[PDB]
């Protein structure tokens, strides 16, 4: 019936150098005297002054050149690890669809989009004086620097599903399925089957939505045939879900979607690696103070806007179409 | 509900070209694996030659497939990699203006040199032609013999060098030629002067033609080459004989008339397959040379019938009927450049028939020049604007058919009506 | 033993379970009882199979997606390339 897969290693992107870079302080703005002019109609002034100030400016660039390369570096394995939702259809052929290992550091990490990388390098500058007035150009310029270079721009993200264990979006009746689509086939694009699998809880599954899961390996238990899907974890109700699930959960991971926002959900933790996925009509609108895990996602048009007290956490969406993740699952069932 | 077209791709060595019948009403996501596993990173799609590759969402029928259609691979176009923000000006004056090839280098100098010696022949030419007219002196055809000696050889020397130095200098030498071949046997300005001055200008035209490597610069000489036979030949006319009561004007219009309509002959005159993109290149050129001839011999005399006041009405209407002759074949001619040319013989015609009101000190029929070239501007800004009238695919058969039949009858007309106007038939 | 791929007839492209060493001339008023001259399979740009031929032995494979054409008059038509 299907393939055989062979797990050669993984191919190393060009990796980031996580350090500390640190930057000299601005000078300490020294007292020029006014040029008391009998010694100026004659031809430490404003030209030694000058002289310094251009002396940091070239500091400055060289450190700015050194934090672009630093930024360049992070994008491009942020480019190399989260591809655009159009790449990974050329994925699962080639020697790249089984790859993401539980050692390399993006490890059940999805792609939700592209916003502002924090940029983890340091950039602390060694300020120790105590509030001795900086020099009104340089300090400027550090300042400028400091604030437009330590955010990178629009770079991919990632919802990392190993450490939230409940991810309950929020909003329009398709639109969040459509993100959902999205980063549920950059899990699956990525990972073995034997590494994670999937489950699913829908009332019009098999329907030209979600039957797109047909095709998933993933979706598979170990020793049972069941007539032509070997598990189907897709189901029409969540506690037959979860008795469907109860030898497979009791490390391999899995990541459970459900549709209904009503007929119990989370009724299968509330565990301890297994991560439900979850759409819900409408917000909670005093949540107390909500935990880091299990956060609340609203999809709007193209931002998928997070509950922070709106802190929107991704400035342009991933959206796939439902015949895209199709092709996605129809060439990722060859392989095994 | 199958379509068959033909799929091209080249990113290896070469490009592989293959027949194939895809299935439509499919959206081409589920296609592409095919054409992709058949013809052979970034996803890719088909795409018509010239346009943006096809979104996969869209089939092959919903955006336009023809049976035999030319289908290329290529990459999905996306979108831009994040273009780079910088904070000091200073270094966003310095790394966003790289994208100016600003380097000033040994490349710059070499048209800056180039440009410099044309402009040094020319203001030459200027300088010594108006004192020789503006005063009486002998040595302004002194330096101007001086000046197109030394573009010829110099044409001539740096010919197997640059190749592209050869040829701009060659073609800026024939207007010192012009003048040193115009200047000789002096008289006041003469009647047999402009045929010394066309016959060196057209000898030196198949000189250089003769020797000039490839193309870039065959339509100009083949052009100013038949021009300079046309001037030739009516000033021999002109100069071996005494009539000159308006006989040269129609003669050249005729002229005209005949290197138009006798182009295609004319042009292949001049004439494994393998060097065939050069040869048709070639022969275009030959072809948009005459028809510039067709023009300019077609306007040269078109103002001398024209040229003094209170002229016969005959000359008056052939003028005319030689220029709507000469734009109504503006249809015939594959090429963009002969359409052009045929096209801008009528504005050609108006701003000489208003530099030749200017010269004569005319002055009332000029701004009526002026009014005929605003009608020639604003029957083309109709033209321009909403781009429906002048298309054939929009006009019917038979009225194009009575259209193509007045402009065989129209230039037609105006051989007889020359052949009156002159007294051939008053005698 | 089966393979699940999607058929194409007019599209909407179906998903049988089509079994391995089994002749088509059972097959194909099967798909056509189940989607919808003889018929046959076919790959998307490609020949027809043989029609007592078996799936394995041409080699088709989960998430392939296989087409239903007619039968053409004998040629394979294999293609020629002008590179």
């Given amino acids: ?336 | 509900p199958i379509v068959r077209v033909a799929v091209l791709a080249a990113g290896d060595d070469g490009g592989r070209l293959t027949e194939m019948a895809l299935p439509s009403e499919l959206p081409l996501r589920e296609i592409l694996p095919a054409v992709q596993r058949i013809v052979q990173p970034v996803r890719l799609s088909l795409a018509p030659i010239g346009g943006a590759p096809f979104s996969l969402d869209a089939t092959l029928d919903t955006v336009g497939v023809v049976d035999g259609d030319l289908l290329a691979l290529q990459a999905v176009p996306s979108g831009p990699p994040a273009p780079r923000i910088v904070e000091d000006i200073a270094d966003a004056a310095v790394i966003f203006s790289e994208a100016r090839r600003r380097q000033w280098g040994p490349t710059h100098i070499a048209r800056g040199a180039a440009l410099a010696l044309i402009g040094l022949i020319l203001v030459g030419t200027g300088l010594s032609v108006a004192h020789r007219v503006i005063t009486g002196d002998l040595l302004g055809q002194f330096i101007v013999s001086g000046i197109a000696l030394a573009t010829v050889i110099a044409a001539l020397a740096v010919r197997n060098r640059s190749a592209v130095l050869a040829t701009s200098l060659a073609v800026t030498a024939l207007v010192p030629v012009a003048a040193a071949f115009a200047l000789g046997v002096p008289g006041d300005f003469g009647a047999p002067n402009v045929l010394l001055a066309a016959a060196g200008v057209a000898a030196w035209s198949l000189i250089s033609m003769a020797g000039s490597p490839d193309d870039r610069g065959i339509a100009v000489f083949t052009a100013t080459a038949v021009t300079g036979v046309g001037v030739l030949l009516v000033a021999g006319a002109a100069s071996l004989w005494v009539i000159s009561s308006d006989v040269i004007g129609c003669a050249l219009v005729l002229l005209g008339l005949i290197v138009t309509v006798q182009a295609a002959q004319l042009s292949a005159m001049w004439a494994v397959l393998a060097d065939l993109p050069r040869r048709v290149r070639v022969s275009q050129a030959h072809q948009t040379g005459v028809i510039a001839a067709g023009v300019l011999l077609g306007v040269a005399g078109s103002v001398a019938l024209v040229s003094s006041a209170n002229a016969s009405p005959w000359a008056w209407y052939i003028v005319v009927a030689a220029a709507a002759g000469a734009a109504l074949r503006a249809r015939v001619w594959d090429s963009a450049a002969c359409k052009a040319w045929l096209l801008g013989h009528s504005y050609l015609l108006a701003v000489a028939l208003l530099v030749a009101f200017v010269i004569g000190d005319r002055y009332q029929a000029a701004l009526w020049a002026l009014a005929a070239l605003a009608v020639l501007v604003l029957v083309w800004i109709v033209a321009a604007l909403n781009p429906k009238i002048a298309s054939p695919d929009t006009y019917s058969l038979p009225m194009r058919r009575m259209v193509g039949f007045l402009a065989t009858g129209l230039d037609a007309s105006l051989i007889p009506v020359m052949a009156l106007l002159v007294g051939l038939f008053s005698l």
Avoid at chain 1, 92 to 97: H, S
Avoid at chain 1, 133 to 153: C, F, I, K, M, W
Avoid at chain 1, 191 to 215: F, I
Wanted: proline share 9%; hydrophobic share 40%.
């Fill in chain 1, 1 to 336: 019936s299907r393939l055989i897969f062979e797990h050669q290693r993984r191919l190393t992107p060009p990796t980031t150098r996580k350090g500390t870079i640190t930057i000299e302080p601005p000078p300490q703005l020294p007292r020029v005297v006014p040029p008391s002019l009998l010694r100026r109609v004659l031809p430490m002034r404003t030209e030694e002054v000058d002289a310094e100030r251009a002396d940091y400016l070239r500091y400055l660039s060289v450190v700015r050149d050194n934090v672009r390369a630093h930024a360049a570096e992070q994008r491009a394995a942020l480019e190399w690890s989260h591809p655009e939702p159009e790449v990974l259809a050329t994925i699962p052929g080639t020697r790249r669809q089984w790859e993401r290992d539980p050692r390399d550091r993006d490890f059940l990490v999805l792609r939700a989009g592209r916003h502002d990388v924090p940029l983890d390098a340091a950039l602390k500058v060694k300020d120790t004086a105590d509030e001795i007035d900086l020099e009104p150009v340089a300090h400027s310029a550090l300042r400028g620097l400091l604030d437009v270079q330590r955010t990178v721009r629009d770079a991919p993200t990632g919802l990392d599903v190993a450490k939230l264990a409940r991810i309950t979006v929020i909003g329009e009746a398709d639109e969040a399925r459509a993100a959902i689509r999205a980063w549920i086939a950059q899990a699956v694009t990525w990972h073995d089957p034997t590494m994670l699998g999937v489950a699913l809880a829908a009332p019009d599954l098999e329907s030209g939505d979600w039957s797109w899961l047909k095709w998933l390996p993933h979706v598979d238990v170990p020793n049972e045939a069941d007539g032509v899907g070997p598990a189907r974890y897709l189901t029409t109700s969540t506690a037959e879900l979860r008795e469907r699930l109860a030898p497979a959960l009791a490390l391999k991971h899995l990541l459970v979607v459900l549709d209904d926002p009503d007929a119990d959900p989370d009724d299968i933790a509330r565990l301890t690696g297994v991560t439900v996925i979850h759409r819900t009509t409408e917000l909670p609108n005093r949540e107390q103070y909500p935990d880091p895990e299990r956060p609340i996602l609203r999809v709007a048009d193209g931002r998928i806007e997070r509950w922070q007290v709106w802190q929107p956490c991704v400035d342009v969406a991933d959206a796939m179409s439902a015949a895209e993740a199709a092709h996605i699952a129809r060439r990722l069932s060859r392989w095994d």
